[PDB]
Amino acid sequence: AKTRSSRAGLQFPVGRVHRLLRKGNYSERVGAGAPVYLAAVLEYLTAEILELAGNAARDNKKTRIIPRHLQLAIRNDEELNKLLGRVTIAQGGVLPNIQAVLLPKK
Amino acid sequence: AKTRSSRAGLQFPVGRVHRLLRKGNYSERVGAGAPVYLAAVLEYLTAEILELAGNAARDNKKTRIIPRHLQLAIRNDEELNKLLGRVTIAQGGVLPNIQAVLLPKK
Amino acid sequence: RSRKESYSIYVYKVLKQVHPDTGISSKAMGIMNSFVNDIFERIAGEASRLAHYNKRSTITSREIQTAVRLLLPGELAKHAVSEGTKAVTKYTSAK
Amino acid sequence: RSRKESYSIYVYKVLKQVHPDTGISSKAMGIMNSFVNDIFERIAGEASRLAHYNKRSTITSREIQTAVRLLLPGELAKHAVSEGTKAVTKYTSAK
Amino acid sequence: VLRDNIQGITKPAIRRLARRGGVKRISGLIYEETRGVLKVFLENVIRDAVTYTEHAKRKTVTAMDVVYALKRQGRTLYGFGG
Amino acid sequence: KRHRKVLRDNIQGITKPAIRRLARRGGVKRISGLIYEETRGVLKVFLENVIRDAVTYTEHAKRKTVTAMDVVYALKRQGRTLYGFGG
Amino acid sequence: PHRYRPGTVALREIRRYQKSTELLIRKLPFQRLVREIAQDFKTDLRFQSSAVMALQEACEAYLVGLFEDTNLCAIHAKRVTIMPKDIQLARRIRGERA
Amino acid sequence: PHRYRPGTVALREIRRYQKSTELLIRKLPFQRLVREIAQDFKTDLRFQSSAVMALQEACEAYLVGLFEDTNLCAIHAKRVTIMPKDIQLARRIRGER
DNA sequence: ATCAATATCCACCTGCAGATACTACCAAAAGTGTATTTGGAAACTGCTCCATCAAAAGGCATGTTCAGCTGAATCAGCTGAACATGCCTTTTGATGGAGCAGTTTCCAAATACACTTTTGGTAGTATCTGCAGGTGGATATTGAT
DNA sequence: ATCAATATCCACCTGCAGATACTACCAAAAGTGTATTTGGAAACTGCTCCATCAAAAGGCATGTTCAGCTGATTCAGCTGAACATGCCTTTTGATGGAGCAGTTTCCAAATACACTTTTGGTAGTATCTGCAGGTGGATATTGAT
Ligand SMILES: [Mg+2]
């Protein structure tokens, strides 16, 4: 027996995605390739987030990713920022940003 | 044979609404009161709007309701304006409103 | 050829109950259709979520009711829960 | 005690693949878990709405794909679509 | 005499929109800026409308394609179906 | 049961220093003194709205406990989706 | 030779256009713009009449709204003249940008 | 004796609190507030402590963002001091009011 | 510039919570393998309704003139930042009790399903009229003097 | 102030673009009779959640001082509003045919159902390690001079 994930060369669980597509009342029927695609798409986006988050961990001289690194990653990336424009990352804080007119002198 | 709508005291179609709930993937199963309730609520809201719309057409010396009347009726009502605050009513225009600071001094 | 179902009719009945001497344009009636479908989806989708959040498999009038309370403003929500509660009663109280 | 499932494992595999020396806090893992479930719903919802607009009882990988195109931004979509099409093609040619 | 399609959205027209919007006085840079904003709006809506089209295997953009695009861009429009 | 102290005027536990801190995370360098009461009013409305909805979920579930999911679902309705508490 | 003072016609136009509901962009140029824009996503496309009218109703509605906010932004800055900076603030705050 | 000039600690604080992520309102008072308000909606309610934290994570993020928009409104009117009218405009343009 | 006050920086260092590590049980998935059902792609094509274009229509490009708005400069007043000082309240971490979320086991009640009547609701067609424009003359508003 | 220029309002008229009305099928509601499914009603757990007590710090409230920001004032210059019209782009309305939509067909793909096998979750114990929070102490930053 091969999992459908391995069949598809995915880390993310294709079967579980299938079930959830069923139990979620999204449509009568579910084509056999939808969960496969979907689980692929989710796996891709979570690889994308982890990549940039890891980088932000390494920049702050850290080995373990915390929410602040996810927040830095998402908010410095144009597209993730948009995909997550109306989402709040608990314990993430904000990007350092001070409006220029507020800085001293001229 | 008696229409569930007439039983329920409603102009709005209880059957159709039961069907629409069945075929929109909202849930596996639908209770019997659910479409009565919903139909009643839809009719209600329709009434309240038509009522105010009517008045606005009456107020502008007219017997036929047009989109404009619906726009005046909705945006001058605090709660309908809220319920429909992210909706464009085609051919509605906007309420007469001029900021005071733009009005001529003398 | 094939049938295009609308509410454009129940609306007209309601218009007549409310303003018997008043009539309505094509476009106006189009808006009223959009409205009815919009609100239908809003209430249905919210009810659908409630039922799923509680692992229930049935959209009963209680979900409808809660959804109405979540979607509608104060008085609007309240006159509506009455009307809907009333309708279920009358339908039930009917041999 | 009931089995509460999550994507923690899939997330941790992928984390090792891209940063093999890097760990994740349980709070951050919670965030990731929210993120996946959120996007799941978003895609599955757009797909549901899509099939329904086109009177199909079936959500195929084609609907997933369009949904992705609707939901995600430019470059992310392009790449997600490739990874998807790739996983399907490979899966289909693996029984 | 050739011209850019976008410049088809004329200063008079723009000024009219502004007036419906209750604006009394308008800087001259507004017109170009307004054209850019309008362009980004249409790009966004049409991209999604056309996506709905292609999914349907159609060669025509239907007013539902548009209504559905508007909906999901949170610009819901009443009076064109749906 | 036996007693349970009356809650009143607890909006005033959103103190001026706390409000000042939130504004600094928000980038604000100088703060008019009427901001503190204005902020408190804006916050009270935000909280009532979220809680009203969250409790509506609690009530519908026939519970007497407001869960993090009740809150998480309320926030989503209200277009303030929150990651990090389930869902 | 009679002459209205600067602002008197403008106010007048507001009062007029707030009263009416006609579209204010000429149809053909709007329609050509739709098709230019659409060509970039897919070639050789046709548009239902109404599908182009829905867009025009949508844009016009959108833009008239943005001008309300834009105007409020000018008035905040103690002006009465709307500049692009006002449009940018409004869009920023609405969350369309930045 | 020593004195930092007006603004200088202000900018210090901004850097400090934009670098960190801890909740800025005290926990206990926030909790009371939550309980008061809920109590006015329904009596005899209990709260998962995480529900209260979700609320506080959410409120604080909401306001920090309101203060960003509020600030841009001040700077748009060539001030550096945020005022109630700034909050009011930001909220209007967001569609809150 | 030069000098002193203090905030900032960073790097090493121990206690420890929170992370990772097994181990093992197993219950709930997920998979595998027939038997069964059908959704929708595929092909054919009828007929809306969309692109194209000719003549009719009326909105807009233009350049000049100066009203009044914007933005710069100055400045007096007073508001809000900084900070020192006094101590109240939140934080932290116990401990008990119970109010209540969370399950499981049995049915009566409710809702789905396959099959047949019986309309209510739609498309296609047939009358019917509200009001969009037109004109005429009184009346109001604006701006010059 | 009065007086002219011109915009606005109001009363009345009338053809026809667009309502409302009528008819006649028929898809899909309703009625009927079994075939599942479900949401509790009771009846128990182990939790989390509430309450409360005591110690302690860590932040809050307050009053004083005055730096510098806001808003008032004044003003010159620049920049957008108002202006008349024929050139030209848009509007209107008539006409082939592109393709949307109607229909029918059938099999590759879906559900369904009963097995068989595996994995992901948790819970019991065990180990570990990243880094939070404390420590000087060497390197800025700021503001008085
Ligand atoms: Mg109270």
Residue numbers in the entry:
A (entry chain C), B (entry chain G): 14 to 119
C (entry chain H), D (entry chain D): 28 to 122
E (entry chain B): 21 to 102
F (entry chain F): 16 to 102
G (entry chain A): 38 to 135
H (entry chain E): 38 to 134
From the article:
Histone proteins package eukaryotic DNA into chromatin, yielding a structural hierarchy, in which nucleosomes comprise the basic repeating units. Each nucleosome consists of a core region, composed of ~146 bp wrapped around a histone octamer, which comprises two copies each of four different core histone proteins. The H3–H4 histone tetramer organizes largely the central DNA of the nucleosome core, while the two H2A–H2B histone dimers organize the outer DNA regions.
